[model samples]
Target chain A: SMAMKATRLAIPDVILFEPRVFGDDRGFFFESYNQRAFEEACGHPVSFVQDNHSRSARGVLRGLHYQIRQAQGKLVRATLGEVFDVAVDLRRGSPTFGQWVGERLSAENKRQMWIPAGFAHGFVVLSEYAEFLYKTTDFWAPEHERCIVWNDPELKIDWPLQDAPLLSEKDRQGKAFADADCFP
Target chain B: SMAMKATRLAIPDVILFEPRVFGDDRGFFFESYNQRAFEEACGHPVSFVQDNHSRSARGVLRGLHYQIRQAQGKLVRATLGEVFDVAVDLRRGSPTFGQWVGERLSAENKRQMWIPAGFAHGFVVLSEYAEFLYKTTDFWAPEHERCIVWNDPELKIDWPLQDAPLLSEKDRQGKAFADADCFP
Candidate 1:
């Protein structure tokens, strides 16, 4: 009866997942990710080879990152604090190309975002800090990795930032959307 | 170079994973689970079909639970507070059968315990509350579900309980080691 709800975002290709959180006095129990449930919702077979976790402070922005060669489908959630998470359609020939959608994920909300391959992903910590977890369908390949500047004019991502964001040298030197290599 | 470290627990088959966490002023980052790293350490391949998360308050104890037919191998971690996690070998003919091991897992430690198939799993909240995550190699089969009483004399799981633990009706009615169904 308590199944995970998967809803398509404004960009129909991206999906938002709301897990069934069964909470009570002793606390709660939930299935964060069930392969069968996920496949039934997304209507496809998927496999994850890596799981990543990152903690970020407020105003810290990471990515708009993707791989040009071997794109990765990511199921991500924020387990602590909150983040203004965003996904941009990067498939060159898709109808929704360059479109972006933003969702707020938090420990309290327990919401997760699914960004399929051929998209760019990034997030800005909205709380004092955030712990972000990702289950990726593909492994990380630094050689093929590409990043679009988070604030590129071509894709006006709405990031709720208080001040200048902390960025890695790679993100700071990211190529603008117009110049970034995208997929088909 | 910075790969996940998999160390065997007192029960050699039970591995403890220590991810290479890269912490900085902005925050920290780590790959909580990597399939290749896990296989290299355990010398075998494993796949997870489901991910479960449970939040429990202090004084709560769950499990010593397992499936008689579809035994689930679980990789578990505590992401919010802390938990005293335990795993007991139930493979009837194995060298360490009926043996148990306990480990302290917490958000601060970022450690994960791998309880392979043919074992019973459970945990007690050591902090005010705890968020426990588990990635299971098999799907849940309630029809084949079984539980060994947490305090069974034969297993002697030393739960560091401050007081009487909050338990489920099923846990309270769990079978003792002498009466429980075990595997070969």
Candidate 2:
């Protein structure tokens, strides 16, 4: 139950999780998360305070979102369908600051991403529909919520887009990455 | 741009939210949340740290869950279909301790519920499916996660169940009210 492989991503703080799944004619089964396992794999104690889920149709892009004051470290996965999940470092002095890493997560693959605090997190739905789930290390403080322009040329994210994606009004008006508030 | 109404529920701390809908021939629009409005209505500044969403099919029952240490206050709503949502007070030394309240939430109704920390939250699907969303004032700590039996005789939650609802292994083995952990 506490068995999982953690792979370092482009950013050292972010991790790619691969769980061992057992499947048969009945169905497939695996632990979505295990506290001890995660702590052991990460080589530190990380606590989660909130669990979040969101459903989106294909071509729907959410985020590049982060909170300034109450930064949250998220463990994310897609329970249904698929998504191109991304995380961008926003810590001002870190070597990886402004850099990003992405992975494709899906129900079939059962992969998960661990995004540490002081980073922006987001994803784009790649299937007809997707249900995204994540555990957060901090609470959501709307007053501190900020969004960076998803298409900021400075970031140069390689999004797999077949068509234009739908965005929230706030997202459409996201601040440029250069102007975003970064963690020091 | 930011507009919504907050109605006090049976439990004073619990608030019901009704957003001002702007509709036309095309469709409808409403702000799900506005920080200034919510703070004014609550008569206090509350910060949320995480936002969560989940989709469940009919006969799916989740929760009667709470955290012991880093408790979280939640703002919950249904975005698709319907559900019978319930919250039970578990704070010891409070006059209303052990009391519970239930509400019917659906996409058509466009209503939301505010559940402060120190209460157990759960919901039962009432339609073909449902997309449930919530904003939390704290993060989720699985080490602190605790569940009270949904069918506890002492709590007596009147779930609108046409048939037995599906449950996770952990939920299936939830602790009885008499044997549950409580907050001070």
Candidate 3:
């Protein structure tokens, strides 16, 4: 299909995509995104309204964030460096609710992660710095946005941290998982 | 609107987009692509069907290429390093037909070039290596693709070259402007 290889992760709902790259000494070429192939992986057609890019230094951790109403399904990848990306399901009816999956997405690996709606997403820089990009299915709603504490004991997500991570003021004051809102 | 600033390039049809970046010592965050704002700048809605990525070493030149039939409009940006991107209007009756515009799109500048379907697109690497990314409004049709030689005197595209540019076999054997087909 000249597309990508999709693998269902431990949290089967979270899919991993490894693009089929055409490479030579000069460099490489790959289809970063194909709508038809993406729809096939999601089991339904999805439309992305926004694309975001961010760069962070090593040890900078950014989320466990999600929105209440405008829940976003994101296709995320790191293009310039490396990041340890994580997604935590917050759909109460799902058996794996509150469960999480983590993966290292980096330029070298050329991989992507699909984090569906009703999940909290975040990542920490693994390289000196990382350029992370994502396409979201919904527009950002600041008032509806919620963040869960990255180190919630209940979640017990094993983050690969070399030292204390730099955090934003909002991230520092994030709610614990037990106190956070979830989709019902 | 919390979006990008759009400027019409020399060829008014070609546009350059500069996003409003939120930056600090930690790094930077920006909406690399915002659909609504993009529509406003383009004066119409655009549906990108494919997203492609390629990397090439310094002095590598590719293009003056476009599909004759399944024409594609591209939003192109460089994610890793730098590149001198160009677009040439190939529409037969357009006032600016045969005219071209070039811009430096780089990760540092965080600029993007919007190249509409009726133009032939190309770029030459300006950094040691560059990772170029583009979203196309149409699917690629290899059979309908056309390539005009980069050194064609008629186009006179002033490529920024430090040394003899590295070129692909197809690029080296591309058709001249006189013999190339144009959209009517």
Candidate 4:
């Protein structure tokens, strides 16, 4: 159902709105993603073409990846475990680029991030096990895959890393934020 | 006032819940911050002892920094301009430490990140000008200040830096996520 949920950021461009979760003793329940209601609440029309889910063990890190060919505007959330999800605006024409925003998301908070197309998304596992999901406007295209180095001095993020984070080969070879391709 | 607003992080520990917003043609309006009601909706109580505000020009990036001794839990939002905001857990005993989350908060979104204590927070301006505001549980302690490199290989974040991202000298000198102390 559509509840009156809303928030305005300092960057009036990006919209942040959320749906309510209904719960009882049996178990808690909420809509992880709802296109029609979301659009109504945020005053924007976004069609979700694909839905993706990923699971990771504690301390695992994934992403900082975006596609040049198929820009994926994602509505991301956490279903289980705990994770710190991130999104970085890669839009060429956007007023904010290289400027990133982050927050903690877990089953506990039920917070979500609306990563508009032309941005890169990634996360680190903070739970013993975590199941993460996202709704994307476009399909994943490996050929057009581009990664921004997770910890580029130019984009200083305070990632709480104890030891080296586990990384995929592709992620390890990501380009510097400055060198990465962006929307025009 | 007690609407269910959720965060999307694919995790449990970091997500947050918020109230709803209502509006009309008269420019519209909503609760900027309500601690008691927020605690009721969030299912947790957060006591904000300090409120901080900052103004910056477009492309300006601040932080990825946190206090070691006096860790600050935050309820962050943007009142003016657009900003790319981020948070990382540095809790030593936390199940999800070294994890990070990002979100775009602007006057348009009205979304906020309920970042608990024991985490690092920062953002970059996306507009010609921005006013970033946040409520912190603890006072600032420069002595315990720590900066984690935003662009670490293992902690890759895709910051859309098509243009030269204006940054502080401290931000440019941030340490890698792996080298930073984190929560368990």
Whichever of 1 and 3 has more lDDT, that candidate is 3
Residue-by-residue lDDT tens digits, candidate 1, A1-184: 6678889999987889998788777889988898988898889899999999998888899997998877899999998899999999998899999899999999988999989999999999988889999999888889999999988998988788879899998899999989888888
For model 4 the TM-score comes to 0.48
Q: What is the C-alpha lDDT of each candidate?
A: 0.90, 0.81, 0.91, 0.67
Candidate 3 C-alpha error for residue A13, in Å: 1.9
Give residue B137's error in model 2 in angstroms: 8.2
Clashes of each: 0, 13, 0, 81
Worst 10 residues of 2 chain A by lDDT: A23-32
lDDT of 3 at A163: 97
Least accurate stretch of 10 residues (summed lDDT) in model 3 chain A?
A20-29
For the second chain, the TM-scores of the candidates in order are 0.97, 0.96, 0.97, 0.85
Candidate 3 at residue A41, lDDT?
Answer: 81
Q: Give all candidate RMSDs, comma-separated.
A: 1.2, 7.1, 1.3, 23.4
Chain A (alone) TM-scores for all candidate structures: 0.97, 0.96, 0.97, 0.88
lDDT of 2 by residue, B21-87 (tens): 6643222335566665777788887766555556677888888899998998988888679999998
Q: lDDT by residue for model 2 over A57-95, one digit each (tens)?
A: 788888889988888888888767999999999989999
Model 1 Cα lDDT, one tens digit per residue, B1-184: 7887778988899999887789787889899888888889879998899999888988899997999888898899999899999999998899998899998999999899998889999999989889899899888888999999989988887788879999998998999999989889
Q: Give Cα distance to truth, residue A156, candidate 2, Å.
A: 6.4
lDDT tens per residue, model 3, A1-184:
5889999998898999999999876788999999888888888988889999998999999998999998899999988789999999899999998899999999889899999888999999989989899999989899999999899999999999989999998998999999999998
